[PDB]
Amino acid sequence: MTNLMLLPDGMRRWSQKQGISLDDSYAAMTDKLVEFTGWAREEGFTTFYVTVSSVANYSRSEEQVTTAMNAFTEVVRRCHDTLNFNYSGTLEVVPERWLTELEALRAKSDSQSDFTLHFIMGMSLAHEVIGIFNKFNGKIPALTEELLAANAYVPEPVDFLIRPGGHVRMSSFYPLMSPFAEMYFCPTLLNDMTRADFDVALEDLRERDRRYGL
Amino acid sequence: MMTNLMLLPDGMRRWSQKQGISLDDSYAAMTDKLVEFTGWAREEGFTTFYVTVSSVANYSRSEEQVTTAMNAFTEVVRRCHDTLNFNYSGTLEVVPERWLTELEALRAKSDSQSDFTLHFIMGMSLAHEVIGIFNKFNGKIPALTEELLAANAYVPEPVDFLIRPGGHVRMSSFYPLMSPFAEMYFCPTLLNDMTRADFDVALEDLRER
Numbered sequence: 001m002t003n004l005m006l007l008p009d010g011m012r013r014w015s016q017k018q019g020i021s022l023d024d025s026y027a028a029m030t031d032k033l034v035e036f037t038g039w040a041r042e043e044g045f046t047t048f049y050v051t052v053s054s055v056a057n058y059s060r061s062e063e064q065v066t067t068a069m070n071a072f073t074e075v076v077r078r079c080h081d082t083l084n085f086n087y088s089g090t091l092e093v094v095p096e097r098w099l100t101e102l103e104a105l106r107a108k109s110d111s112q113s114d115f116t117l118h119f120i121m122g123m124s125l126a127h128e129v130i131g132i133f134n135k136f137n138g139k140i141p142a143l144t145e146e147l148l149a150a151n152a153y154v155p156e157p158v159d160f161l162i163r164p165g166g167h168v169r170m171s172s173f174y175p176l177m178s179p180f181a182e183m184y185f186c187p188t189l190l191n192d193m194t195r196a197d198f199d200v201a202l203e204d205l206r207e208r209d210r211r212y213g214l
Numbered sequence: 215m216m217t218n219l220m221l222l223p224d225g226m227r228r229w230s231q232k233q234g235i236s237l238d239d240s241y242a243a244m245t246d247k248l249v250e251f252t253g254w255a256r257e258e259g260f261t262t263f264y265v266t267v268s269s270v271a272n273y274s275r276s277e278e279q280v281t282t283a284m285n286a287f288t289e290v291v292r293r294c295h296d297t298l299n300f301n302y303s304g305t306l307e308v309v310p311e312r313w314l315t316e317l318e319a320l321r322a323k324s325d326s327q328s329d330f331t332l333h334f335i336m337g338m339s340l341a342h343e344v345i346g347i348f349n350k351f352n353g354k355i356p357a358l359t360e361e362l363l364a365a366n367a368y369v370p371e372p373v374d375f376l377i378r379p380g381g382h383v384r385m386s387s388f389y390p391l392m393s394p395f396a397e398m399y400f401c402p403t404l405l406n407d408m409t410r411a412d413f414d415v416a417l418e419d420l421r422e423r
Protein backbone atom coordinates (compact mmCIF):
# COMPACT_ATOMS: atom_id res chain seq x y z
CA MET A 1 0.00 0.00 0.00
CA THR A 2 1.25 3.40 -1.12
CA ASN A 3 0.10 7.00 -0.69
CA LEU A 4 0.75 10.10 -2.80
CA MET A 5 1.23 13.78 -1.89
CA LEU A 6 0.79 16.71 -4.28
CA LEU A 7 2.04 20.31 -3.90
CA PRO A 8 -0.17 22.40 -6.24
CA ASP A 9 1.69 25.38 -7.69
CA GLY A 10 1.53 27.77 -10.63
CA MET A 11 -1.97 29.29 -10.58
CA ARG A 12 -0.85 32.92 -11.05
CA ARG A 13 1.65 32.11 -13.80
CA TRP A 14 -1.06 30.05 -15.48
CA SER A 15 -3.51 32.96 -15.23
CA GLN A 16 -1.04 35.27 -16.98
CA LYS A 17 -0.13 32.54 -19.49
CA GLN A 18 -3.77 31.86 -20.44
CA GLY A 19 -4.75 35.55 -20.34
CA ILE A 20 -7.53 34.93 -17.81
CA SER A 21 -8.36 36.10 -14.32
CA LEU A 22 -6.88 34.45 -11.24
CA ASP A 23 -10.36 33.21 -10.33
CA ASP A 24 -10.68 31.28 -13.60
CA SER A 25 -7.18 29.85 -13.10
CA TYR A 26 -8.33 28.56 -9.71
CA ALA A 27 -11.44 27.04 -11.31
CA ALA A 28 -9.14 25.20 -13.71
CA MET A 29 -7.17 24.18 -10.61
CA THR A 30 -10.36 22.73 -9.10
CA ASP A 31 -11.05 20.67 -12.23
CA LYS A 32 -7.40 19.58 -12.42
CA LEU A 33 -7.41 18.44 -8.80
CA VAL A 34 -10.60 16.41 -9.36
CA GLU A 35 -8.89 14.73 -12.32
CA PHE A 36 -5.78 14.17 -10.20
CA THR A 37 -7.81 12.58 -7.40
CA GLY A 38 -9.33 10.20 -9.93
CA TRP A 39 -5.89 9.34 -11.32
CA ALA A 40 -4.44 8.65 -7.87
CA ARG A 41 -7.39 6.42 -6.98
CA GLU A 42 -7.04 4.51 -10.26
CA GLU A 43 -3.30 4.04 -9.62
CA GLY A 44 -3.91 2.13 -6.39
CA PHE A 45 -2.93 4.81 -3.87
CA THR A 46 -4.73 4.47 -0.55
CA THR A 47 -4.45 8.16 0.34
CA PHE A 48 -4.03 11.26 -1.80
CA TYR A 49 -2.61 14.14 0.27
CA VAL A 50 -2.97 17.67 -1.10
CA THR A 51 -0.98 20.50 0.46
CA VAL A 52 -3.60 23.24 0.38
CA SER A 53 -1.59 26.03 1.95
CA SER A 54 1.27 27.07 4.17
CA VAL A 55 0.85 29.46 7.09
CA ALA A 56 2.56 32.15 5.00
CA ASN A 57 -0.07 31.79 2.25
CA TYR A 58 -2.68 33.28 4.60
CA SER A 59 -0.57 36.46 4.60
CA ARG A 60 -1.79 37.16 1.07
CA SER A 61 -4.74 39.49 0.52
CA GLU A 62 -8.17 38.35 1.72
CA GLU A 63 -9.38 38.22 -1.89
CA GLN A 64 -6.73 35.65 -2.82
CA VAL A 65 -7.28 33.70 0.41
CA THR A 66 -11.03 33.52 -0.27
CA THR A 67 -10.60 32.58 -3.94
CA ALA A 68 -8.06 29.85 -3.18
CA MET A 69 -9.87 28.37 -0.17
CA ASN A 70 -13.11 28.29 -2.17
CA ALA A 71 -11.34 26.61 -5.09
CA PHE A 72 -9.92 23.86 -2.85
CA THR A 73 -13.27 23.44 -1.07
CA GLU A 74 -15.01 22.97 -4.43
CA VAL A 75 -12.89 19.85 -5.07
CA VAL A 76 -14.36 18.27 -1.94
CA ARG A 77 -17.84 19.50 -2.86
CA ARG A 78 -17.55 17.56 -6.12
CA CYS A 79 -15.82 14.37 -4.91
CA HIS A 80 -16.78 13.91 -1.24
CA ASP A 81 -19.65 11.46 -1.85
CA THR A 82 -17.43 8.71 -3.32
CA LEU A 83 -14.37 8.87 -1.04
CA ASN A 84 -13.28 9.39 2.55
CA PHE A 85 -12.31 13.00 3.21
CA ASN A 86 -10.14 14.27 6.05
CA TYR A 87 -8.10 17.33 6.92
CA SER A 88 -5.42 18.54 9.32
CA GLY A 89 -2.86 21.29 9.84
CA THR A 90 -2.49 24.59 11.67
CA LEU A 91 -6.23 25.16 11.68
CA GLU A 92 -6.13 28.33 13.81
CA VAL A 93 -4.88 30.41 10.85
CA VAL A 94 -7.60 29.18 8.47
CA PRO A 95 -10.72 31.41 8.32
CA GLU A 96 -13.39 29.65 10.37
CA ARG A 97 -15.87 29.58 7.44
CA TRP A 98 -13.77 27.04 5.54
CA LEU A 99 -13.16 24.98 8.67
CA THR A 100 -16.93 24.75 9.10
CA GLU A 101 -17.62 23.79 5.48
CA LEU A 102 -14.78 21.24 5.32
CA GLU A 103 -15.96 19.79 8.63
CA ALA A 104 -19.46 19.34 7.20
CA LEU A 105 -18.03 17.77 4.03
CA ARG A 106 -15.93 15.36 6.07
CA ALA A 107 -19.00 14.36 8.07
CA LYS A 108 -20.82 13.77 4.77
CA SER A 109 -17.99 11.80 3.12
CA ASP A 110 -17.84 8.02 2.65
CA SER A 111 -15.94 6.91 5.75
CA GLN A 112 -16.07 3.29 4.49
CA SER A 113 -14.24 4.07 1.24
CA ASP A 114 -10.82 2.48 0.80
CA PHE A 115 -9.57 5.72 -0.84
CA THR A 116 -8.87 8.87 1.18
CA LEU A 117 -8.52 12.48 0.09
CA HIS A 118 -6.70 14.44 2.80
CA PHE A 119 -6.23 18.21 2.82
CA ILE A 120 -3.39 19.71 4.84
CA MET A 121 -3.80 23.42 5.52
CA GLY A 122 -1.36 25.90 7.03
CA MET A 123 1.67 23.65 6.70
CA SER A 124 4.77 24.74 8.62
CA LEU A 125 7.07 22.43 10.56
CA ALA A 126 7.72 25.13 13.17
CA HIS A 127 4.00 25.61 13.82
CA GLU A 128 3.43 21.84 13.82
CA VAL A 129 6.16 21.14 16.38
CA ILE A 130 5.11 24.12 18.51
CA GLY A 131 1.50 22.92 18.48
CA ILE A 132 2.44 19.38 19.51
CA PHE A 133 4.65 20.68 22.34
CA ASN A 134 2.01 23.11 23.60
CA LYS A 135 -0.57 20.31 23.42
CA PHE A 136 1.42 17.81 25.50
CA ASN A 137 3.52 20.25 27.59
CA GLY A 138 3.47 19.07 31.19
CA LYS A 139 0.85 16.37 30.52
CA ILE A 140 3.02 13.34 29.65
CA PRO A 141 6.31 12.14 31.20
CA ALA A 142 7.98 12.05 27.77
CA LEU A 143 7.21 12.26 24.06
CA THR A 144 7.33 8.96 22.16
CA GLU A 145 7.52 8.26 18.44
CA GLU A 146 4.04 6.72 18.61
CA LEU A 147 2.43 9.86 20.06
CA LEU A 148 4.38 12.15 17.73
CA ALA A 149 3.23 10.08 14.74
CA ALA A 150 -0.32 10.16 16.11
CA ASN A 151 -0.27 13.98 16.25
CA ALA A 152 1.62 14.96 13.09
CA TYR A 153 -0.32 16.79 10.37
CA VAL A 154 0.33 13.92 7.95
CA PRO A 155 -0.83 10.81 9.88
CA GLU A 156 1.48 8.35 8.06
CA PRO A 157 4.78 8.32 6.15
CA VAL A 158 4.47 9.71 2.61
CA ASP A 159 5.68 7.43 -0.18
CA PHE A 160 5.65 9.75 -3.20
CA LEU A 161 5.66 13.54 -3.35
CA ILE A 162 5.13 15.58 -6.52
CA ARG A 163 5.74 19.33 -6.87
CA PRO A 164 4.96 20.83 -10.28
CA GLY A 165 5.62 24.46 -11.14
CA GLY A 166 9.39 24.43 -11.64
CA HIS A 167 10.63 25.17 -8.10
CA VAL A 168 13.06 22.64 -6.62
CA ARG A 169 12.38 23.22 -2.92
CA MET A 170 9.93 22.03 -0.29
CA SER A 171 9.03 25.44 1.26
CA SER A 172 6.86 24.76 4.37
CA PHE A 173 5.43 21.49 3.00
CA TYR A 174 7.92 18.81 4.05
CA PRO A 175 6.04 15.98 5.83
CA LEU A 176 7.40 15.51 9.34
CA MET A 177 7.22 11.70 9.59
CA SER A 178 8.36 10.85 6.02
CA PRO A 179 12.16 10.57 6.26
CA PHE A 180 12.44 8.45 3.07
CA ALA A 181 9.70 10.02 0.95
CA GLU A 182 10.59 10.08 -2.74
CA MET A 183 10.42 13.56 -4.26
CA TYR A 184 9.61 14.46 -7.86
CA PHE A 185 9.88 17.95 -9.34
CA CYS A 186 8.69 18.95 -12.81
CA PRO A 187 8.52 22.34 -14.56
CA THR A 188 4.95 21.86 -15.80
CA LEU A 189 2.43 24.15 -14.15
CA LEU A 190 -0.25 22.18 -12.31
CA ASN A 191 -3.07 23.30 -14.60
CA ASP A 192 -1.12 22.00 -17.62
CA MET A 193 -0.51 18.58 -16.05
CA THR A 194 -1.84 15.73 -18.18
CA ARG A 195 -2.50 12.12 -17.27
CA ALA A 196 0.64 11.25 -19.24
CA ASP A 197 2.73 13.66 -17.16
CA PHE A 198 1.36 11.99 -14.02
CA ASP A 199 2.13 8.55 -15.46
CA VAL A 200 5.75 9.36 -16.32
CA ALA A 201 6.12 10.90 -12.86
CA LEU A 202 4.96 7.56 -11.43
CA GLU A 203 7.41 5.73 -13.69
CA ASP A 204 10.20 7.87 -12.24
CA LEU A 205 9.02 7.44 -8.64
CA ARG A 206 8.35 3.68 -8.87
CA GLU A 207 11.60 2.94 -10.73
CA ARG A 208 13.71 4.28 -7.83
CA ASP A 209 15.48 1.90 -5.45
CA ARG A 210 14.29 2.63 -1.90
CA ARG A 211 16.93 1.62 0.65
CA TYR A 212 15.95 3.51 3.85
CA GLY A 213 19.54 4.20 4.89
CA LEU A 214 20.44 0.51 4.71
CA MET B 215 26.72 38.04 6.44
CA MET B 216 25.46 34.54 7.23
CA THR B 217 25.34 32.25 4.19
CA ASN B 218 25.02 28.49 4.48
CA LEU B 219 25.47 25.40 2.35
CA MET B 220 24.45 21.86 3.27
CA LEU B 221 25.83 18.80 1.50
CA LEU B 222 24.30 15.31 1.64
CA PRO B 223 27.24 13.10 0.58
CA ASP B 224 26.02 9.97 -1.20
CA GLY B 225 27.20 7.22 -3.53
CA MET B 226 30.22 5.61 -1.85
CA ARG B 227 29.04 2.03 -2.40
CA ARG B 228 28.24 2.57 -6.09
CA TRP B 229 31.58 4.34 -6.53
CA SER B 230 33.41 1.39 -4.97
CA GLN B 231 31.68 -0.91 -7.46
CA LYS B 232 32.37 1.51 -10.32
CA GLN B 233 36.10 1.76 -9.57
CA GLY B 234 36.47 -1.91 -8.62
CA ILE B 235 37.89 -0.97 -5.21
CA SER B 236 37.05 -1.68 -1.59
CA LEU B 237 34.51 0.32 0.40
CA ASP B 238 37.39 1.63 2.53
CA ASP B 239 39.17 3.08 -0.51
CA SER B 240 35.94 4.64 -1.78
CA TYR B 241 35.53 6.28 1.64
CA ALA B 242 39.14 7.48 1.44
CA ALA B 243 38.24 9.16 -1.84
CA MET B 244 35.23 10.56 0.03
CA THR B 245 37.56 12.04 2.65
CA ASP B 246 39.70 13.70 -0.02
CA LYS B 247 36.60 14.92 -1.84
CA LEU B 248 35.09 16.39 1.33
CA VAL B 249 38.29 18.26 2.13
CA GLU B 250 38.12 19.66 -1.40
CA PHE B 251 34.44 20.52 -0.95
CA THR B 252 35.04 22.31 2.34
CA GLY B 253 37.72 24.35 0.58
CA TRP B 254 35.33 25.16 -2.28
CA ALA B 255 32.56 26.27 0.08
CA ARG B 256 34.98 28.50 1.98
CA GLU B 257 36.22 30.06 -1.27
CA GLU B 258 32.62 30.72 -2.36
CA GLY B 259 31.91 32.83 0.74
CA PHE B 260 29.75 30.46 2.78
CA THR B 261 30.01 31.13 6.51
CA THR B 262 29.10 27.57 7.57
CA PHE B 263 29.36 24.33 5.61
CA TYR B 264 26.98 21.67 6.95
CA VAL B 265 27.71 18.02 6.15
CA THR B 266 25.12 15.39 7.04
CA VAL B 267 27.31 12.55 8.33
CA SER B 268 24.63 9.98 9.08
CA SER B 269 21.00 9.31 9.81
CA VAL B 270 19.81 7.32 12.81
CA ALA B 271 19.02 4.42 10.46
CA ASN B 272 22.59 4.43 9.12
CA TYR B 273 23.85 3.17 12.49
CA SER B 274 21.83 -0.03 11.96
CA ARG B 275 24.28 -1.08 9.23
CA SER B 276 27.00 -3.60 10.03
CA GLU B 277 29.70 -2.51 12.47
CA GLU B 278 32.40 -2.61 9.76
CA GLN B 279 30.46 -0.20 7.54
CA VAL B 280 29.75 2.19 10.43
CA THR B 281 33.43 2.10 11.39
CA THR B 282 34.55 2.79 7.81
CA ALA B 283 32.18 5.72 7.30
CA MET B 284 32.65 7.33 10.72
CA ASN B 285 36.42 7.02 10.35
CA ALA B 286 36.31 8.68 6.92
CA PHE B 287 34.32 11.69 8.16
CA THR B 288 36.41 11.93 11.32
CA GLU B 289 39.49 11.93 9.08
CA VAL B 290 38.05 14.98 7.32
CA VAL B 291 37.98 16.70 10.71
CA ARG B 292 41.50 15.41 11.49
CA ARG B 293 42.79 17.11 8.35
CA CYS B 294 40.84 20.37 8.61
CA HIS B 295 40.41 21.21 12.31
CA ASP B 296 43.54 23.38 12.58
CA THR B 297 42.40 25.94 9.98
CA LEU B 298 38.65 26.22 10.63
CA ASN B 299 36.05 26.20 13.37
CA PHE B 300 34.51 22.73 13.80
CA ASN B 301 31.19 21.89 15.45
CA TYR B 302 28.78 18.96 15.55
CA SER B 303 25.25 18.10 16.67
CA GLY B 304 22.48 15.55 16.24
CA THR B 305 21.22 12.41 17.98
CA LEU B 306 24.48 11.84 19.81
CA GLU B 307 23.17 8.88 21.85
CA VAL B 308 23.30 6.60 18.77
CA VAL B 309 26.84 7.58 17.70
CA PRO B 310 29.51 5.11 18.90
CA GLU B 311 31.36 6.77 21.78
CA ARG B 312 34.77 6.31 20.16
CA TRP B 313 33.84 8.78 17.43
CA LEU B 314 32.05 11.15 19.83
CA THR B 315 35.20 11.28 21.96
CA GLU B 316 37.56 11.88 19.05
CA LEU B 317 35.24 14.44 17.42
CA GLU B 318 34.77 16.23 20.75
CA ALA B 319 38.53 16.44 21.26
CA LEU B 320 38.93 17.74 17.70
CA ARG B 321 36.16 20.32 18.16
CA ALA B 322 37.75 21.61 21.37
CA LYS B 323 41.04 21.98 19.43
CA SER B 324 39.56 23.64 16.34
CA ASP B 325 40.21 27.21 15.20
CA SER B 326 37.48 29.10 17.03
CA GLN B 327 38.62 32.35 15.39
CA SER B 328 38.03 31.16 11.83
CA ASP B 329 35.20 32.96 10.07
CA PHE B 330 34.38 29.66 8.33
CA THR B 331 32.73 26.76 10.14
CA LEU B 332 32.51 23.08 9.25
CA HIS B 333 29.54 21.52 11.09
CA PHE B 334 28.77 17.79 11.17
CA ILE B 335 25.23 16.62 11.92
CA MET B 336 25.15 12.98 13.03
CA GLY B 337 22.16 10.71 13.59
CA MET B 338 19.75 12.97 11.73
CA SER B 339 16.03 12.24 12.17
CA LEU B 340 13.22 14.79 12.56
CA ALA B 341 11.34 12.52 15.00
CA HIS B 342 14.35 12.11 17.32
CA GLU B 343 15.10 15.84 17.06
CA VAL B 344 11.57 16.91 18.04
CA ILE B 345 11.40 14.27 20.78
CA GLY B 346 14.68 15.48 22.27
CA ILE B 347 13.57 19.12 22.24
CA PHE B 348 10.22 18.24 23.84
CA ASN B 349 11.82 16.11 26.56
CA LYS B 350 14.26 18.93 27.25
CA PHE B 351 11.56 21.59 27.68
CA ASN B 352 8.64 19.39 28.81
CA GLY B 353 6.89 21.05 31.75
CA LYS B 354 9.58 23.71 32.22
CA ILE B 355 8.31 26.53 29.97
CA PRO B 356 4.75 27.86 29.48
CA ALA B 357 4.94 27.44 25.70
CA LEU B 358 7.41 26.63 22.94
CA THR B 359 8.61 29.64 20.93
CA GLU B 360 10.26 29.79 17.52
CA GLU B 361 13.36 31.21 19.22
CA LEU B 362 13.82 28.23 21.53
CA LEU B 363 13.06 25.76 18.75
CA ALA B 364 15.56 27.49 16.45
CA ALA B 365 18.13 27.55 19.27
CA ASN B 366 17.73 23.80 19.94
CA ALA B 367 17.48 22.36 16.41
CA TYR B 368 20.28 20.14 15.09
CA VAL B 369 21.02 22.74 12.40
CA PRO B 370 21.42 25.97 14.44
CA GLU B 371 20.63 28.40 11.59
CA PRO B 372 18.62 28.53 8.35
CA VAL B 373 20.22 26.71 5.43
CA ASP B 374 20.48 28.71 2.21
CA PHE B 375 21.44 25.98 -0.27
CA LEU B 376 21.15 22.19 -0.06
CA ILE B 377 22.96 19.91 -2.51
CA ARG B 378 22.52 16.15 -2.86
CA PRO B 379 24.73 14.37 -5.41
CA GLY B 380 24.37 10.67 -6.16
CA GLY B 381 21.15 10.69 -8.19
CA HIS B 382 18.51 10.20 -5.48
CA VAL B 383 15.84 12.90 -5.21
CA ARG B 384 14.91 12.53 -1.52
CA MET B 385 16.04 13.78 1.88
CA SER B 386 16.65 10.34 3.47
CA SER B 387 16.12 11.65 7.05
CA PHE B 388 18.39 14.69 6.44
CA TYR B 389 15.84 17.52 6.06
CA PRO B 390 16.81 20.59 8.15
CA LEU B 391 13.97 21.41 10.53
CA MET B 392 14.17 25.23 10.54
CA SER B 393 15.00 25.92 6.86
CA PRO B 394 11.61 26.63 5.24
CA PHE B 395 13.21 28.69 2.47
CA ALA B 396 16.16 26.46 1.55
CA GLU B 397 16.74 25.88 -2.17
CA MET B 398 17.46 22.27 -3.20
CA TYR B 399 19.78 21.00 -5.95
CA PHE B 400 20.07 17.34 -7.01
CA CYS B 401 22.51 15.93 -9.57
CA PRO B 402 23.24 12.36 -10.72
CA THR B 403 27.03 12.62 -10.37
CA LEU B 404 28.34 10.54 -7.49
CA LEU B 405 30.05 12.61 -4.80
CA ASN B 406 33.50 11.17 -5.50
CA ASP B 407 33.14 12.24 -9.16
CA MET B 408 32.13 15.84 -8.39
CA THR B 409 34.45 18.46 -9.90
CA ARG B 410 34.87 22.11 -8.99
CA ALA B 411 33.00 22.96 -12.20
CA ASP B 412 30.08 20.73 -11.16
CA PHE B 413 29.96 22.63 -7.87
CA ASP B 414 30.16 25.97 -9.70
CA VAL B 415 27.23 25.19 -12.02
CA ALA B 416 25.28 23.88 -9.02
CA LEU B 417 25.86 27.29 -7.41
CA GLU B 418 24.82 29.03 -10.64
CA ASP B 419 21.54 27.11 -10.55
CA LEU B 420 20.95 27.77 -6.85
CA ARG B 421 21.89 31.48 -6.97
CA GLU B 422 19.81 32.21 -10.09
CA ARG B 423 16.65 31.25 -8.22
Ligand SMILES: CC(C)=CCC/C(C)=C/CSP(=O)(O)OP(=O)(O)O
Nearest residue numbers: 009010011012013053057065068069
Ligand atom coordinates in the same frame (compact mmCIF):
# COMPACT_ATOMS: atom_id res chain seq x y z
C1 LIG C 1 -5.49 28.38 0.20
C2 LIG C 1 -4.67 29.65 0.33
C3 LIG C 1 -5.04 30.72 1.36
C4 LIG C 1 -3.63 29.84 -0.45
C5 LIG C 1 -3.24 28.79 -1.48
C6 LIG C 1 -2.41 29.50 -2.53
C7 LIG C 1 -1.69 28.53 -3.46
C8 LIG C 1 -2.29 27.17 -3.80
C9 LIG C 1 -0.53 28.90 -3.95
C10 LIG C 1 0.25 28.00 -4.89
S1 LIG C 1 -0.14 28.60 -6.56
P1 LIG C 1 0.65 30.56 -6.80
O1 LIG C 1 1.88 30.71 -5.94
O2 LIG C 1 -0.38 31.58 -6.39
O3 LIG C 1 1.03 30.76 -8.39
P2 LIG C 1 2.56 30.99 -8.94
O4 LIG C 1 3.04 32.34 -8.47
O5 LIG C 1 3.47 29.90 -8.41
O6 LIG C 1 2.54 30.94 -10.45
Ligand SMILES: CC(C)=CCC/C(C)=C/CSP(=O)(O)OP(=O)(O)O
Nearest residue numbers: 223224225226227228268272280283
Ligand atom coordinates in the same frame (compact mmCIF):
# COMPACT_ATOMS: atom_id res chain seq x y z
C1 LIG D 1 27.20 4.30 7.66
C2 LIG D 1 27.25 5.69 8.28
C3 LIG D 1 27.14 5.86 9.79
C4 LIG D 1 27.38 6.75 7.51
C5 LIG D 1 27.48 6.55 6.00
C6 LIG D 1 26.23 7.08 5.33
C7 LIG D 1 26.64 7.70 4.00
C8 LIG D 1 27.79 8.71 3.94
C9 LIG D 1 26.02 7.35 2.90
C10 LIG D 1 26.44 8.00 1.59
S1 LIG D 1 27.19 6.80 0.46
P1 LIG D 1 26.15 4.97 0.66
O1 LIG D 1 24.69 5.25 0.89
O2 LIG D 1 26.72 4.23 1.85
O3 LIG D 1 26.38 4.11 -0.72
P2 LIG D 1 25.36 4.13 -2.01
O4 LIG D 1 24.45 2.93 -1.92
O5 LIG D 1 24.52 5.39 -2.00
O6 LIG D 1 26.16 4.08 -3.29
Ligand code: DMA
Nearest residue numbers: 007008009051052053054171
Ligand atom coordinates in the same frame (compact mmCIF):
# COMPACT_ATOMS: atom_id res chain seq x y z
C1 DMA E 1 2.58 24.07 -3.37
C2 DMA E 1 2.09 25.32 -2.64
C3 DMA E 1 0.68 25.34 -2.06
C4 DMA E 1 2.89 26.36 -2.53
C5 DMA E 1 2.46 27.62 -1.79
O1 DMA E 1 2.57 28.77 -2.58
P1 DMA E 1 4.06 29.39 -2.91
O2 DMA E 1 5.09 28.56 -2.19
O3 DMA E 1 4.29 29.33 -4.40
O4 DMA E 1 4.13 30.96 -2.39
P2 DMA E 1 5.51 31.80 -2.06
O5 DMA E 1 5.72 32.85 -3.13
O6 DMA E 1 5.35 32.49 -0.72
O7 DMA E 1 6.70 30.88 -2.00
Ligand code: DMA
Nearest residue numbers: 211212213222223267268386
Ligand atom coordinates in the same frame (compact mmCIF):
# COMPACT_ATOMS: atom_id res chain seq x y z
C1 DMA F 1 24.91 10.72 5.06
C2 DMA F 1 24.09 10.65 3.78
C3 DMA F 1 23.78 11.93 3.00
C4 DMA F 1 23.65 9.49 3.36
C5 DMA F 1 22.84 9.35 2.07
O1 DMA F 1 21.53 8.96 2.39
P1 DMA F 1 21.13 7.37 2.46
O2 DMA F 1 21.93 6.57 1.46
O3 DMA F 1 21.37 6.82 3.86
O4 DMA F 1 19.52 7.26 2.13
P2 DMA F 1 18.84 6.13 1.15
O5 DMA F 1 19.04 4.76 1.76
O6 DMA F 1 17.37 6.43 1.03
O7 DMA F 1 19.47 6.18 -0.22
Ligand SMILES: [Mg+2]
Nearest residue numbers: 009010011165
Ligand atom coordinates in the same frame (compact mmCIF):
# COMPACT_ATOMS: atom_id res chain seq x y z
MG1 LIG G 1 3.67 29.50 -6.40
Ligand SMILES: [Mg+2]
Nearest residue numbers: 224225226380
Ligand atom coordinates in the same frame (compact mmCIF):
# COMPACT_ATOMS: atom_id res chain seq x y z
MG1 LIG H 1 23.15 6.00 -0.48
